[PDB]
Amino acid sequence: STGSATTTPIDSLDDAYITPVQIGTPAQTLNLDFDTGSSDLWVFSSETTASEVDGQTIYTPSKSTTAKLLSGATWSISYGDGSSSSGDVYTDTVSVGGLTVTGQAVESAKKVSSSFTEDSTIDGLLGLAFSTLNTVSPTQQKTFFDNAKASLDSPVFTADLGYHAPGTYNFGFIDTTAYTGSITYTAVSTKQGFWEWTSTGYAVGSGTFKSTSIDGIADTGTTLLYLPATVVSAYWAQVSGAKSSSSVGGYVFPCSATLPSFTFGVGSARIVIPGDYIDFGPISTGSSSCFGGIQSSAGIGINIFGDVALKAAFVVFNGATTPTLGFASK
Template structure:
């Protein structure tokens, strides 16, 4: 995914980290305590949402052709299981969450978007002459740099792109050190990347969709190098309306960030994404759509449906289409019913306060949209900031429970 307004890879935030627990064996119980890594998130209120830009960027991502945080300097030793917290910034009102990842020896800190909708780790480098506002990776300054030289490139449907060469180096996420991680060094970036708020992107999708075949993702290397006890990571995204915040917990989950029971939903990873079967969508108790495919994507801001499903949802809320995939909706949500997604026999909620994405004068834009270019639906941060999700890479599945911020 690319970092933008809808397709803005998650922005991470600083929260106090207590004990975190590993992936539960039984969906009726919370996980048992295990060593984990947590990446925390913090809110930044100095940004105005843009629903049209968010929609355009999300569509571009899935039509692709091929305030400074505290330094993360306390790196753990490679080969050990460790626990770490990374202070991060939430850029905008629940639009994009990013955190610090350290790369090289000595480590250099980069602002990185965490994205379950892609699988590459790429960063701006000193080889990129147009990358004037980003922190740049310099291979000559790292003792652990290993040359690879194979080319990589990413092209998106909106014309944005990035390309460069592969390398290997030490990567630190929280206090977990990944040795010999393949990284993609940008030699060229289009302006939307080169002048963006972040320095790169870390994909948390499956390895089958990396731009170069055979590359292991950072999370795959955490597992294969024995750096985490469980092949899972938990995601909590906070709401700006509740002081923002959030965290990524690698190797387990944090039960203090969700309420009630975790419910397991099988994942279809055949396309490299965290795909789920959505059996029903309701507005309150009234069904408006059924039987369609969805993707859980931390790198997309909105809920994005096919046109038919979006129109059904809009009709139930009295929303009016703007002719560009977005909808105008009443700013007063006091009489709205929640939007309910049924997956594997369980209901998961998006409450009424999350149905408004942007206010523009006397009217509001809805937090859902559509694109005729997509044949699936994307459950972005609008869903994920209301539901805590544990992603299991080894046995493709997710566990979902209401976030502490849901209501």
């Protein structure tokens, strides 16, 4: 089997991407944030505290003839941005782009933190990291990809995120028309539960490539590119007037600037992030200070190849017995 679904930016900045997902019988379609940095499929629901729902579409398990309470199971997750959610668990039929999994754990939110409430466009998350990170207790549950894998034509999914435009998540096949050149594959460590890999270096604009190992994670659920402070300083030093602002929470730059590109290495291959992809717009409405799309990872503990980086590539998440990542230009 295969599946193919379009993923759409939630706003004009590509702050996140939403993909329609069918849950239950008859189908209830929710727009989920596909997150290769976590491993829970959770949704706003008829159980979510009413004051914490503000415009999201909810899953109502009592209206699904295939929903079953997973008795005794609870979940609770906290994300790197400080947001969180928790609740109980149903199993139900879940379909993405024509690919159907029966008995998928659908984690129903009883509580969500304010940033989820405040984002009316995201109805939940669909985790695509390794199932060892799934938070369901006392019986850990499998991701949608893990459940689908054996049925797929090939044990892979691909992320093809658009810049200020829709893109595609495919399951079970590699669309050879969706990228240019060849796909360069690179080793993955699953030891932390992430799609963790080592970039071979970087360049800023037209500058020379610096060969240096940068361990980080391919994370579709993180908006920006978070790299070591040395690398980030070297980038922003090429932008007149750019500075790190403690009050704003990262590097800012004059909105009048033209940003240089940023290149990252994948083995001997190179992925070029155009400068425009690094512009996240005014820090507040009407400001002439703009927020940068490359930020320091120093306070995180891990480097994160988020959407800013991934949207410059066609990315293969290869879930074979030894997982690997593939990157192609497009």
